[PDB]
Amino acid sequence: LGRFWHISDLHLDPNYTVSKDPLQVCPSAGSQPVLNAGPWGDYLCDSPWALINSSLYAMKEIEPKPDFILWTGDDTPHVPNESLGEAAVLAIVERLTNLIKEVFPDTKVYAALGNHDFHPKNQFPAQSNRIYNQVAELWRPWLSNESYALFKRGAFYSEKLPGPSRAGRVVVLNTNLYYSNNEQTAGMADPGEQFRWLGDVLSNASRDGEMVYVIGHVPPGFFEKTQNKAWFRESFNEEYLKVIQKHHRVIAGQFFGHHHTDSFRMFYDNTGAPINVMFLTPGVTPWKTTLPGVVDGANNPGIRIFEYDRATLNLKDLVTYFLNLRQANVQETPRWEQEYRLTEAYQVPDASVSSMHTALTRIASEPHILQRYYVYNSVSYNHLTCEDSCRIEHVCAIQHVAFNTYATCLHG
Numbered sequence: 439l440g441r442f443w444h445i446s447d448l449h450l451d452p453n454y455t456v457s458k459d460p461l462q463v464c465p466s467a468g469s470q471p472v473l474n475a476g477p478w479g480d481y482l483c484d485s486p487w488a489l490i491n492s493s494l495y496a497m498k499e500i501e502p503k504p505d506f507i508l509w510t511g512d513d514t515p516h517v518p519n520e521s522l523g524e525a526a527v528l529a530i531v532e533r534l535t536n537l538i539k540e541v542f543p544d545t546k547v548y549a550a551l552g553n554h555d556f557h558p559k560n561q562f563p564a565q566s567n568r569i570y571n572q573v574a575e576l577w578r579p580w581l582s583n584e585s586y587a588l589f590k591r592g593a594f595y596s597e598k599l600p601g602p603s604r605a606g607r608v609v610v611l612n613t614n615l616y617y618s619n620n621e622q623t624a625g626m627a628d629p630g631e632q633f634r635w636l637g638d639v640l641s642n643a644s645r646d647g648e649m650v651y652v653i654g655h656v657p658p659g660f661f662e663k664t665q666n667k668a669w670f671r672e673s674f675n676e677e678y679l680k681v682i683q684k685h686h687r688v689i690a691g692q693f694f695g696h697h698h699t700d701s702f703r704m705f706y707d708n709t710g711a712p713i714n715v716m717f718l719t720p721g722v723t724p725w726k727t728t729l730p731g732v733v734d735g736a737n738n739p740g741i742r743i744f745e746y747d748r749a750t751l752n753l754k755d756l757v758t759y760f761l762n763l764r765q766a767n768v769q770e771t772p773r774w775e776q777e778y779r780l781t782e783a784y785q786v787p788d789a790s791v792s793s794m795h796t797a798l799t800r801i802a803s804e805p806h807i808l809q810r811y812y813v814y815n816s817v818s819y820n821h822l823t824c825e826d827s828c829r830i831e832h833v834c835a836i837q838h839v840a841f842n843t844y845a846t847c848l849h850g
């Protein structure tokens with residue numbers, strides 16, 4: 439039984455300062471007053487370094503020798519582009535990279551860029567550029583010669599897993615190419631040929647008897663905290679689904695971030711069979727989202743460990759740990775605690791597709807499992823009751839990655 443960490447959406451705010459002026463605590467809060475800010479963060483702000491540093495040392499205390507770490511990006515604060523130039527973006531990525539290397543010096547890391555890990559934000563090109571080149575240098579100790587060259591061209595690559603994993607591979611995607619807000623890829627059907635490449639990698643995995651973990655930042659499908667919000671342009675969403683439907687047999691897991699909340703996505707084939715599951719891990723940043731329509735969209739800082747079978751990559755469980763930020767900010771040292779273990783929360787034997795399908799059916803039919811899922815969705819920040827509209831937004835998002843079936847579900 440192996441273990442790996444999945445961390446995402448650290449979002450450092452470099453200028454976080456405990457101040458008596460509520461409007462000069464953190465630029466990531468915009469114009470919002472930040473009253474009595476604490477040293478470990480505030481729900482209106484992106485992460486101070488002290489929170490990020492806390493999260494990495496909490497990982498080391500919980501499991502200092504993971505088989506590997508998945509890191510799915512988004513390192514910089516939610517501020518205007520004019521406040522955050524290219525040099526600062528790269529310095530922030532480098533600082534976080536060095537922290538991970540310092541705390542886990544012997545651990546392989548599989549790292550993807552998030553949509554904020556660029557200047558201007560979200561404008562990821564389908565060709566080489568200074569950011570891809572420089573990040574490739576930062577992550578070179580983690581990259582094969584082949585992955586190094588591929589990262590410079592498109593910030594995507596695939597790597598063998600280390601022993602003792604029998605026949606495993608991690609595929610690292612740049613799904614920021616597919617974000618609707620990315621004008622660099624408008625009018626391109628296969629930017630960087632990433633979909634063609636991905637299919638070839640997965641065909642190779644089948645030929646070679648390997649199983650694959652796919653990771654990336656921006657997920658396909660919709661955002662469970664609202665209605666009708668998808669990140670991918672529709673054509674890219676369709677193409678991603680087509681890849682999963684063709685190659686699901688070799689995909690043992692999908693691991694994404696970007697939402698900052700805790701959820702999962704089911705994939706089905708045209709016979710209704712469940713064929714894959716994507717796990718959306720919460721963020722370390724607690725930052726209350728500015729997305730229109732979302733009310734009180736903050737979360738507690740979260741980190742996640744997966745348990746897996748090294749021989750098959752079958753996912754046996756996940757444990758999510760969290761920092762109760764409200765409590766931590768009256769304390770001398772933040773102390774992270776277990777939030778939940780998946781098998782216990784949903785009374786399923788493992789984290790397989792069949793088990794996650796059962797979890798979904800219980801979320802959709804049992805009030806107390808729905809509420810349990812909903813509390814964990816914000817990393818136990820919000821304990822209010824998830825009513826009917828909330829229920830339908832979450833169930834439809836978990837169940838339907840496709841645009842058209844999601845929309846029909848929302849008629850419910």
Ligand SMILES: *[C@@H]1O[C@H](CO)[C@@H](O[C@@H]2O[C@H](CO)[C@@H](O[C@@H]3O[C@H](CO)[C@@H](O)[C@H](O[C@H]4O[C@H](CO)[C@@H](O)[C@H](O)[C@@H]4O)[C@@H]3O)[C@H](O)[C@H]2NC(C)=O)[C@H](O)[C@H]1NC(C)=O
Pocket residue numbers: 583584635638639642
């Ligand atoms: C699916 O599997 C196939 C194998 O069946 C795989 O094809 C292999 O791809 C690798 C990687 O591109 C090829 O190896 C390269 O070969 C070329 C030509 O000999 C070399 O130039 C490369 O080596 C140099 O590259 C750098 C310079 O650009 C140097 O810095 C570096 O140190 C090397 O000196 C590299 O070895 C290999 O030839 C093919 N094999 C076959 C049979 O085609 C394919 O890539 C897989 N598909 C995917 C999407 O991964």
Ligand SMILES: *[C@@H]1O[C@H](CO[C@@H]2O[C@@H](C)[C@@H](O)[C@@H](O)[C@@H]2O)[C@@H](O[C@@H]2O[C@H](CO)[C@@H](O)[C@H](O)[C@H]2NC(C)=O)[C@H](O)[C@H]1NC(C)=O
Pocket residue numbers: 451452453465515517520521522
């Ligand atoms: C955070 O604040 C910096 C300015 O802070 C100063 O420069 C840092 C390098 C560091 O030494 C601090 O202690 C200093 O007090 C912002 O950077 C400036 O942004 C303005 C635009 O508003 C720009 O005109 C300046 O050229 C920038 N300065 C530098 C040195 O680049 C930065 O934007 C703030 N970060 C965020 C996320 O808002």
Ligand SMILES: *[C@@H]1O[C@H](CO)[C@@H](O[C@@H]2O[C@H](CO)[C@@H](O)[C@H](O)[C@H]2NC(C)=O)[C@H](O)[C@H]1NC(C)=O
Pocket residue numbers: 487488491492495
């Ligand atoms: C990052 O977090 C670590 C761990 O909490 C801090 O290192 C500890 O600091 C305390 C007090 O200085 C010591 O008692 C411990 O021995 C240190 N190490 C460990 C493993 O606990 C470190 O100071 C933090 N760094 C920053 C910049 O905040």
Ligand SMILES: C[N+](C)(C)CCOP(=O)(O)O
Pocket residue numbers: 447512516553554661696697698727728729
């Ligand atoms: C709005 N949101 C926070 C839920 C998703 C966008 O995430 P981010 O890329 O701005 O960090």
Ligand SMILES: [Zn+2]
Pocket residue numbers: 447449512552696697698721
């Ligand atoms: Zn984010």
Ligand SMILES: [Zn+2]
Pocket residue numbers: 516554
């Ligand atoms: Zn954003």
Ligand SMILES: [Zn+2]
Pocket residue numbers: 683686707713
């Ligand atoms: Zn099939």
Ligand SMILES: [Zn+2]
Pocket residue numbers: 512552553554655695696697
């Ligand atoms: Zn993001």
Ligand SMILES: [Zn+2]
Pocket residue numbers: 762775
């Ligand atoms: Zn507690």
